[PDB]
Amino acid sequence: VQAEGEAEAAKMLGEALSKNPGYIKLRKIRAAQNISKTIATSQNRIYLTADNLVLNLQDESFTRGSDSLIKGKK
Amino acid sequence: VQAEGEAEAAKMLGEALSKNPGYIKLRKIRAAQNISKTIATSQNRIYLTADNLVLNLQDESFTRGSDSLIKGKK
Amino acid sequence: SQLITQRAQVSLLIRRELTERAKDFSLILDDVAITELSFSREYTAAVEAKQVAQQEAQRAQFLVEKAKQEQRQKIVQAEGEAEAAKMLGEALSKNPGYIKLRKIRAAQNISKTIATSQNRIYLTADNLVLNLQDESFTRGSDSLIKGKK
Amino acid sequence: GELITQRELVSRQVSDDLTERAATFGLILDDVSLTHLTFGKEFTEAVEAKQVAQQEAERARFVVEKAEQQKKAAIISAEGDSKAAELIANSLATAGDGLIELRKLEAAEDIAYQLSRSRNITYLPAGQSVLLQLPQ
Amino acid sequence: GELITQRELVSRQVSDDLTERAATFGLILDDVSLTHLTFGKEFTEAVEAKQVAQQEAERARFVVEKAEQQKKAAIISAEGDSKAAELIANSLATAGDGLIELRKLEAAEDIAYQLSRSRNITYLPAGQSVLLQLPQ
C-alpha cells in the first residue's frame, strides 16, 4: 500500500503529459527557482554554461540560441 | 486555485506572442537591465563573449554580426 | 469547549451536587461557584482560528480587487515600453548606422562608468589597434575596399 | 474514560470499601472520596483532539478562503508582463527586427552601468575555436 | 460584530442578570453595564480593511496617474539617441564607410584617455591560433 501511492500518482502523471515540454521545462525551471532558493541553506559552489546568466550578448551563439523564436532556428 | 493563476496567465502570454522575437528579446534585455541592476546587491564575477561590450570593432566577426541590418546577413 | 460554552451548566451542576453533599453533615451551602477554568489551548485555539481565517478571506478579497486595478497601473506602465518600441521599430530597418553607433556610444558611456566599476576587461582581435600589419589587420581594414567588408 | 464518565461509581466504591475497611480497625469513615485523579497523556488527549480538529476543520476551511485571495498576487504580478507581450508581439512581427534588436544595446548600457556595481565581469569571443581559462 | 452592533442588548442582559443576581445576596444593583470590551484582531480588523482598501482603491487609481507621467522619462532619455540614428543612418548609408570607421579611433583616444583611470587593461592579437593566459 505504500507504493501503490507512487504508482497511481504515476498513472495520472503518465497519461497526462505526452504532448510537448510545457510544464516539464516549467518544472525544470520552478526547480531552478526552489532548488536554488534552498541552495541558500546550502553552500553550493555552482559553475555554469553557455547562456545561463545572460551574456553571450551578441556572439552568434547568443543570437542563434535566441532565434528559437524564429520558427526554424529552434 | 494557487496555480490556475500561473495557468491563465499562461493562456494570455501564450496566445499572445507567436509571431517574432520582439519582446522576448526586449525582455532578455530588460533582463540585462534589471538583472544586473540587482547584481549590485550581488557580487557576481561575470565573464563574457563575442560582441557584448562592443569591441570586435573591425574584425569581420564584428561587421558580419552587425550586418544583420543588411537584410540577408542576419 | 463545552465547559467554556456551557460554564453556566457546569457551575450550576457543581453547586447542585455539592449543596446536597454538604447538607448530609449539617452544612447549608448558600453558594457554590466555579472560580476558574483552564485547558491546554488546542480546541479553543482552532475554534478561534476558524473565524480568524473566515474573515481573513475578506481581508484579502478586497485586496484581490485592489490588485485587479493596481494591474492597470502596470498596463499603463508598459504601454510606455511598447509605443517607444513602435517608434524605435518602424524606425531603423535599413542598415546598422546608429545600432553600431550605439554599440559605440555604449563603448563610450559604458566604460565611462566602468570607472565607478572595477572591471577586469579582456579583449580581442583588433580593438586596441594593433594587428598593425598582420594581414588580419589589413583585411579587417579593407572593409573600406568595397568588397573586402 | 470509564473512570470518570462513571466517577461517581468509582469514588463511591472506594469510599464504602474504605469505610468498611476502617470499621474493622475501629474507625468510622463518615465519608470518603477521590481527592486526586489523572491518567496518561494520549488516550487522555486524543479523544480531546477528536473534537479539537473538528474545529481545526473550520480553521482550514477558512485558511482556504485566505489563500483564494492571496494567490491573486501571483496572478497579478505577471498579468501586465503579459499584456506587454500582447502588444509588442504583433507590433514587431509585422514591423520587423527593429527593436527586436536595438533594445539589446540600450541594454548594453543599462546592463553594465549596473555591472559596475559588480566587480568581476569578464569576456571572450567566438568564431574561433575559442577556449576559456579563468581567474580566481 | 454582533456584540456591539447590538451592544445595548448585551450590556442590558448582563446588567439585569447581575441585578437579579445581587438581589439574592441582598444587593441592589441600581445599575450595571459593560465597562470594558474588545475582541481578537482580524475578524475585528478585516471588515475594517474592507472599507480601508475601497479607498486604497483610489490611492492606486491615482498612483496610476503618477506612473503615466513618470515613464515619459524612460521614453525621453532615449528619444534623441534615436533621432541621431534617423540622421546618421541615411547619412553614411549613401555616404559610405567614412565615419562608420573613423570615430572608432577618435574612440581609441577617448576610450583609453579614460582607461587610464582603470588600471588593469591587457591585450592580444588574432590571425594566429591566439590563445590566452591572464594574470591575477
Residue numbers in the entry:
A (entry chain A), B (entry chain W): 226 to 299
C (entry chain U): 151 to 299
D (entry chain V), E (entry chain T): 137 to 272
Task: Quote the paper.
Prohibitin complexes are dome-like structures consisting of prohibitin -1 and -2 heterodimers that assemble in the IMS via their N-terminal transmembrane helix. Prohibitin-1 and -2 (PHB1 and PHB2) are members of the Stomatin/prohibitin/flotillin/HflKC (SPFH) protein family. Among other proposed functions, the prohibitin complex supports cristae architecture and negatively regulates the activity of the matrix-resident AAA protease (m-AAA), which cleaves numerous matrix and IM proteins. Three-dimensional (3D) subclassification of the subtomogram averages revealed two distinct conformational states of the prohibitin complex present in untreated and OA-treated cells, both of which resolved to approximately 20 Å.
We termed these two conformational states “open” and “closed” on the basis of detectable protein density for the dimeric membrane-anchoring domains of the prohibitin complex. Density for all 12 heterodimer pairs was visible in our initial subtomogram average, allowing us to model a fully enclosed dome complex. Finally, the top of the dome is assembled by tight packing of the C-terminal helix C-α2, leaving a central pore that is formed from the disordered C-terminus that forms a beta strand complementation with adjacent subunits. Prohibitin 2 contains an additional C-α3 that sticks up above the dome cap. This fully assembled closed prohibitin dome is approximately 20 nm in diameter and rises 10 nm above the membrane. We refer henceforward to the fully assembled state as the closed conformation. The closed conformation manifests additional density extending 3 nm on the matrix side of the IMM, while the open complex is associated with minimal matrix density. An additional unmodeled density occupying 180 nm3 was present on the matrix side of the membrane which cannot be accounted for by prohibitin itself. There is insufficient unmodeled mass in prohibitin 1 and 2 to account for this density, which therefore most likely reflects ordered portions of prohibitin-associated proteins or alterations to bilayer organization. Quantification of the two populations of complexes revealed a statistically significant shift from 75 open to 56% open after depolarization, indicating that the prohibitin complex is basally in a dynamic assembly of states and that depolarization drives the complex toward closure. Under depolarization, prohibitin shifts to the closed “inactive” state, which could, in principle, reduce the degradative capacity of m-AAA with respect to integral membrane proteins of cristae.
